[PDB]
Structures are given as structure tokens and as C-alpha cells.
Amino acid sequence: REHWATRLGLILAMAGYAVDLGNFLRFPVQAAENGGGAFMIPYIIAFLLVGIPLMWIEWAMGRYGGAQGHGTTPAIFYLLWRNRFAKILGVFGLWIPLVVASYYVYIESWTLGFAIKFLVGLVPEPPTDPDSILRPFKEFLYSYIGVPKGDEPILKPSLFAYIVFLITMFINVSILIRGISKGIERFAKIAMPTLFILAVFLVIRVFLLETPNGTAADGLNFLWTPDFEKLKDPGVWIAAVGQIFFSLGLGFGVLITFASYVRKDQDIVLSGLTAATLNEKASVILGGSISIPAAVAFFGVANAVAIAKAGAFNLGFITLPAIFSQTAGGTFLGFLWFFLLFFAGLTSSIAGMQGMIAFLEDELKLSRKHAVLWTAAIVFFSAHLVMFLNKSLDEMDFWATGIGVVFFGLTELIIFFWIFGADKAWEEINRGGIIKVPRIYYYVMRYITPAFLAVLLVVWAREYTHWTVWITRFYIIGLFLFLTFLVFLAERRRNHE
Ligand SMILES: CN[C@H]1CC[C@@H](c2ccc(Cl)c(Cl)c2)c2ccccc21
Ligand code: NA
Ligand code: NA
């Protein structure tokens, strides 16, 4: 079996997975709409009661199953719980990341495309007034995506956007085809420093932004200013819990797959806590000091709520490029921005597609070349549903990463800590640990964490379309069935040998 080369590379690949666009865009927006700096109160709490424990558990299940040549949850859930239903539940942790991949790489391709467009100067040049600056970039993006002009739910992406997507995929394959150590890890040692560099440079440049409308200090002011009255809102306490899942990457079965390349007695306690911290520092320090400040600085704190309510996607693909077309040499800033975002995705999409690659290697005994190509061929095909069917993206994401990861996360808890047994699990986590997990986390992992996951699981089901959504539902259900069939073939090949 493949293994990570250096302890550093492990943490960087682990941090590379969790460090993403959401760090720079989604996190700053959620904080601004949920109490500013007061949002740190329920967020830090959720980082402690939910995010850290669940991460250790996936590191635990990962390493536990990796020692036996199995990196995926259809196998690992059967090792924690020898059952017919356990294999079926494990399919989700191979289904989820395959669904997300169908649309993540595509969104990743966009940043690559914009980075290229910005670098060569192929960007809109307005003109005065805010809607006079934003509209040229709102249209620039929509011509790239192919946003429907008519009533039809059909997207018509540019030939360029499509080609970059092939190129983007090709880039992903290159890294994945070289393996865990000479590929993902080797890249994680290049990307993460390069990432941090671009991040700091933008932070420095952003703090030097001054307009008649405001300064970067006003952005950091508005953003981090605590609104403790919003802490009364349960929804804020829910946004915090959902965000932790999102930021860390829990419930994607990727940590489990990635941790399955960690050696049997190698530390997973401190290493994970490091990668977890790298992601958080990336968010509160680097991320919340570029996007929100730069917007408030240019449009004034009088629009700060309007900008936050405009969404994270707008902030990074429409709002910030429009601001860069109005700054000194900002055509190159546009490039550094979309190139910062490209790596943030590439370090996460190589981690996402490994779950399928691991399954084809471990369970169907395919070579690494075939496992990588066939996974690519599957992702490339399914993305056409995302590229051409309007709102197909929202549908896949809602199920996979809105209900799916939260459900599957509570599944990992119960299977590893209630079915497999808490004591056997607790030992599995602490073993080989440089530092030992605090004795108090035994109770958190057993009650508090699955409680939080459960009471959240109740509200997102109580709180929550066209007809074309059935097309996407049809396809992604058909994915689950097909993956059930491969798990079935995997267990019929094993009885013969
Ligand atoms: C974990 N937070 C980021 C990390 C990578 C990125 C991600 C996660 C899983 C996969 Cl399978 C892929 Cl391809 C990509 C992602 C997706 C959705 C939501 C959040 C995030
Ligand atoms: Na994150
Ligand atoms: Na990443």
C-alpha cells in the first residue's frame, strides 16, 4: 500500500484539502451575517465540541482501515460493523465525494479560466456608480458560465470555459496519477507555501487600499465587530455548526481515505490538530482580511451589509474582479486572486477524487493508472450535467453537501463509537499519538458530538423547485445504485479468491 513520505507532507496535504475557496469567501460572509466577531463564540464552540472530535474519528477510522488495505467506507464500515447494512451505509462515503467532484472541478476550472483571462488582459474595462461597474463583470462571468438568457434551464458555456475544464481535469489527473507521495504530497509541499505567499501579498496590498468611499480598516472594522444580540438566534448557532463541517471537510469520507495512507502506529492526534489549525488560521487571518475589507474599502461601509447579503460567490467572481479593474495594476491582482483560488481548489479536488481511486485500487484491484483514468472519465461525464443543465449544480450540492455530509458524519460517529465500541475506538484514536487526547473528549465524542449533529439534523429537515431537478435526482440516484453494484462486485471477487 502507498504511504505518506514525511509528516510535514501529511499535514500539508491534509491542510491542502481543507483550505479552499470557502476559507476566503464563505467564512467571512457567514461571520458578517451572524454577529461579526460575536460569531466567533458559537464558531469556536463548534470547533471544539464537533469539528475536532469528528476529525480525529475519521483519522482513526482511516488509519484503522488503512492498516488492512482498505481506504474507503464501504470496507471500513464493515470492519467496524460486520453487517449488510454497514456496507450500504458506507456507499455514501464514496457517493458523496463523487457527486461533489462532478461540480467542484468545474468551479475550479473557472478560477483557472479567469486567471488566464485576467493575466492576458481579456477582462471588461468599465465605465461612476456601483451598478455601472458591477454589470460589466456580472455579464463577463455569465458569458463564461453560459447563464440562460431565456426561460429554458439550459446553460451554454463558452468554448473557452469548456476547454479550461478539460485542461483543469488534465491537471488533476497529472497529480493523482503519480500517487500519494510523489504526487499529492509532492504538490502539497509546493502549493501550500505558494498559497500562503499569495494570501499574504493580497492582505498587504488590501490594507493599502484607499478610496473616497473608505479604507481597509473599515472592512476589518465592520467584519469583526461583535453583534452579541444575534447569539440569541439559534440559526446563528446552526450556521456555526454547519460551517465547521464545511470548513474542515467532515462527512466527505476524504479524511478517512487520506488518513488511510498514514502508517499503523504513526500519530494522528497531533497531526490532525495541526492541519485543523492551519485551516482555521487561514480563514480568520488570511481570508477575512482580503475579501470583505477590499469590498467595504471600495464601496464604503454603507454597503457592507448589502455586499455580505449578496453572497460569497458574487463577492469573489463579480464584486472583487470589478474592484480590481479600478485599482492600480489591478489586472495583475485579478490574476493573483484567481490563481490563489485555483490552487485552493486543486489541493482539494485531488483529495476528493482519491476516494474513488482508492476504492478501485483496494477493492477492485485496479492499477493506479486505470483507477485514476476511470475516475476521471466518470467525473468528466457527470460534470456535463452540471455544465449544461441549469440548477443541476444546486441540486447535487444540496443532497451531497447539505444533507449528505451531515448525515454521513453522524453515521461515522455511531458506527465507530457506539457500534464498534467506544473503548476500542478511543484507543484507536490515541494510539501512536505524540500527544494524548484529553480525557474529557471521551464524553464529547460519545454524547455531545452526536447530539449536536442530531439536533442540527432535525432543523435542516424541518426548515427544508422545477421539474428538471428530477433529471439531476435521477442521475445522482443512479450513481448510488451503480456504486452499490461495484461494492457488490468487490465482495464477489473476494469470495472467489
Ligand atoms: C472542506 N471544505 C472545502 C474543502 C474541499 C472541497 C471538496 C470536498 C470534497 C470533494 Cl470530493 C471535493 Cl472534489 C472537493 C470542498 C467542497 C465542498 C465544500 C467544501 C469544501
Ligand atoms: Na476550510
Ligand atoms: Na485546497
What does this structure look like?
InterPro entries: Na/ntran_symport, SNS_sf. It is found in: Membrane. Phosphocholine 1 binds at residue 84. Phosphocholine 2 binds at residue 84. The chain is 75% helix and 1% strand. The chain is mostly helical and 497 residues long. It has one domain. The protein has a two-stranded antiparallel sheet with strand order 1-2. A hairpin with a 2-residue loop joins strand 1 and strand 2 (214-215). Helix 4 crosses helix 22 and helix 8 (159-176) runs antiparallel to helix 19. The protein is globular and about 70 Å long. One sodium ion is lined by residues 18-20, 22-23, 247, 279.
Précis, in short:
With 497 residues, the protein is mainly alpha-helical. It has helices at 7-18, 21-24, 26-32, 40-66, 73-80, 84-120, 130-145, 159-176, 180-207, 216-224, 234-248, 254-259, 269-286, 291-299, 304-309, 312-324, 330-352, 354-362, 368-388, 392-419, 422-430, 441-463, 469-496; strands spanning 210-211, 214-215. It is built from 23 helices and two strands.
